[PDB]
Curated annotation (Swiss-Prot), chains A, B:
Belongs to the cyclic nucleotide phosphodiesterase family. PDE9 subfamily. Pathway: Purine metabolism; 3',5'-cyclic GMP degradation; GMP from 3',5'-cyclic GMP: step 1/1. This is High affinity cGMP-specific 3',5'-cyclic phosphodiesterase 9A. It comes from Homo sapiens. Mg(2+) binds at residue 113. Inhibited by zaprinast; inhibitor is however not specific to PDE9A. Specifically inhibited by BAY-73-6691 (1-(2-chlorophenyl)-6-((2R)-3,3,3- trifluoro-2-methylpropyl)-1,5-dihydro-4H-pyrazolo(3,4-d)pyrimidine-4-one). BAY-73-9961 has two enantiomers, (R) and (S), due to the presence of a chiral center, and both forms vary in their pattern of interaction. Specifically inhibited by PF-4181366 (4H-Pyrazolo[3,4-d]pyrimidin-4-one, 1- cyclopentyl-1,5-dihydro-6-[(3S,4S)-4-methyl- 1-(6-quinoxalinylmethyl)-3-pyrrolidinyl]-one). The chain holds residues 241 to 566 of 593 of the full protein. It is an enzyme of class 3 (hydrolase). The gene is PDE9A.
Length: 326, 326
């Protein structure tokens, strides 16, 4: 017949394995279904005896704890989780990783931005917010995301880990905290340097080596929008700027310092992305290719195309702003 | 928070394992949810690699193929399956049957009345209907139910058996055909004897003994309404008689012979159940108790009560009639 949206079509489930997945077509429930599918399709529900109904109540509770920010919302959480899923296949991670590592990667991806307020760490700190005070100015948001993540898992009806031995729970919790805190871009340069150092002789058996690979992987998925088709990727830039402007506006109406790349008067869609793709996204993915070559053709390619389009879009912006000058 | 209806609550997941579960409390979505749970709970999803999304579409296609009959509708098949599920627990059937036989048992129960027209075989045959002509008067309805069942499983996106090797599929299909065809009451006495015969020295090793046991199991669940609590059971009697009268009226209208037990001028809710419980239901469960003693308390007990209740209800009924000519 013609089943309800909650049910994915076999086509959708096939496309769910690729980074070309159009994340914009779905309602929260269809997304919840794709997330649910990923846990089954990866052996996680199986290998960790996750109660199938609990998996769903957990996903609803998670979704319920994301806010309606223009960027940091549940759909962002979904893109990140969905991209991570694509990489588990693209790079055949289940070969290099244990199921516990996969559990940690996916679960951290889904919870990495829980309860985000829409104003980054810098605002929190400069505004001396309740979060900044609670976390002594140390990765306040990310710390907060973890806390909320484990508060949700503390509710028995949502505890997708209730059938995991405490020894393994401790390992999963430690892994998730490390990954969620690694998403703080303040630590980008440091983490990248650490990874590249280990890269001088990677070892899939070295535990510190694998922890950095996972940190790099979740970081990759978190900021991978431009890896997607321009039609799917662009609307995200607008949401990010919408959130950025909202913060800077507030920072101005409070005399608090403002960042150039978040300032209405100094940034454009293209200037936001050119620097980012060239000095952040590409280098990070570039070093990952050395570990997984297929990454180049599937993710480094669209990034070059992306970087090129904005570099052109920038010339037109300038040309139009020169006819607005006096 | 408050999760949608298709997410079963713990209290429901536990009541679902008993013949005492109240089937009239749910809507198709909730019932579709309970069925899905059953497959997960019995580990059928596990041991057969049933893609969980595929299972959802399938149950949905099955629900679409049931008709708005007063008795033979989706809710009826839900009862049959739920009762089957109950017995797997009560009787610890997984201790006697393989996961293949439990799959056959459960799947057959859900499909046993697919696309039922609302008029029994006697009607199909006397009216020389298309089904009667298609099946040469041999169990036209049961053969049809089975055929729709496999027409549904033939749709790639509904084939919950997609990951079973063809060797296994064959075995599942033969079992299902056997079980669904065994539900034709015209075959009752015949099947009861084969079973009673082999019961003299039942042997779970013997494949023929197991086939008869499974045939008895699906037959028990298919007509088990009276095993359920008087409140849950009674409404079904009305649904059945409604369906029966619909047929008898049409038969009288088209000059076709009418069955006494479907005659509006002879049948009464009471007389219908006394004969049925005493001569069909109780005798069948009595023989099953010899293999599963726990059945006597959980199923025979409520049947004795129901029998006495309708028998008293018959005295009242007579008393009331004679009070109308004295
Ligand atoms: C101090 O650490 C940082 C912070 C920001 C940036 N780059 C940006 O924020 C640029 C200007 N905008 C940008 N930021 C992006 C994108 C994707 N995620 N993402 C993002 C979102 C929240 C926090 C940080 C970043 C990078 C993106 O496509 N563009 C680079 C490094
Ligand atoms: C020839 O096979 C039959 C057919 C009917 C009966 N007796 C009945 O149908 C009695 C009068 N009504 C009855 N019939 C019932 C019940 C449950 N299923 N069920 C039923 C439904 C469809 C076809 C046959 C039966 C027995 C029930 O609780 N009562 C007994 C034997
Ligand atoms: C399978 O169809 C049957 C046949 C018999 C019964 N049980 C009875 O015969 C009931 C308990 N006693 C009874 N039943 C009667 C009478 C007349 N018709 N009738 C009856 C009741 C239900 C169904 C068919 C008939 C003929 C009657 O005088 N007494 C119940 C269902
Ligand atoms: Mg974040
Ligand atoms: Mg039937
Ligand atoms: Zn994020
Ligand atoms: Zn039936």
């Amino acid at each position: 017949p013609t089943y309800p949206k909650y049910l994915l079509s076999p086509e959708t489930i096939e496309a769910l394995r690729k980074p070309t997945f159009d994340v914009w077509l779905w309602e929260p429930n269809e997304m919840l279904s794709c997330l649910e599918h990923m846990y089954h399709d990866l052996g996680l529900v199986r290998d960790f005896s996750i109660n199938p109904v609990t998996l769903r109540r957990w996903l609803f509770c998670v979704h319920d704890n994301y806010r309606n920010n223009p960027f940091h919302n549940f759909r962002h959480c979904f893109c990140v989780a969905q991209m991570m899923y694509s990489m588990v296949w693209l790079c055949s991670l289940q070969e290099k990783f244990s199921q516990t590592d996969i559990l940690i990667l996916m679960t951290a991806a889904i919870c990495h931005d829980l309860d985000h307020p829409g104003y980054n760490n810098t605002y929190q700190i400069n505004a001396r917010t309740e979060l900044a005070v609670r976390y002594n100015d140390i990765s306040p948001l990310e710390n907060h995301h973890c806390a909320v993540a484990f508060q949700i898992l503390a509710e028995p009806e949502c505890n997708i880990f209730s059938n995991i031995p405490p020894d393994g729970f401790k390992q999963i919790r430690q892994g998730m905290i490390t990954l969620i805190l690694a998403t703080d871009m303040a630590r980008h340069a440091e983490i990248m340097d650490s990874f590249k150092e280990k890269m001088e002789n990677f070892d899939y058996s070295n535990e510190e080596h694998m922890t950095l690979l996972k940190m790099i992987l979740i970081k990759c998925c978190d900021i991978s929008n431009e890896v997607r088709p321009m039609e799917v990727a662009e609307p995200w830039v607008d949401c990010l700027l919408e959130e950025y402007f909202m913060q800077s506006d507030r920072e101005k109406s409070e005399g608090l310092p403002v960042a150039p790349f978040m300032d209405r008067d100094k940034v454009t869609k293209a200037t936001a992305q050119i620097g980012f793709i060239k000095f952040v996204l590409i280098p990070m993915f570039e070093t990952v290719t050395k570990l997984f070559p297929m990454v180049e053709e599937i993710m480094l390619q669209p990034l070059w195309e992306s970087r090129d389009r904005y570099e052109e879009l920038k010339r037109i912006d300038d040309a139009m702003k020169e006819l607005q000058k006096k």
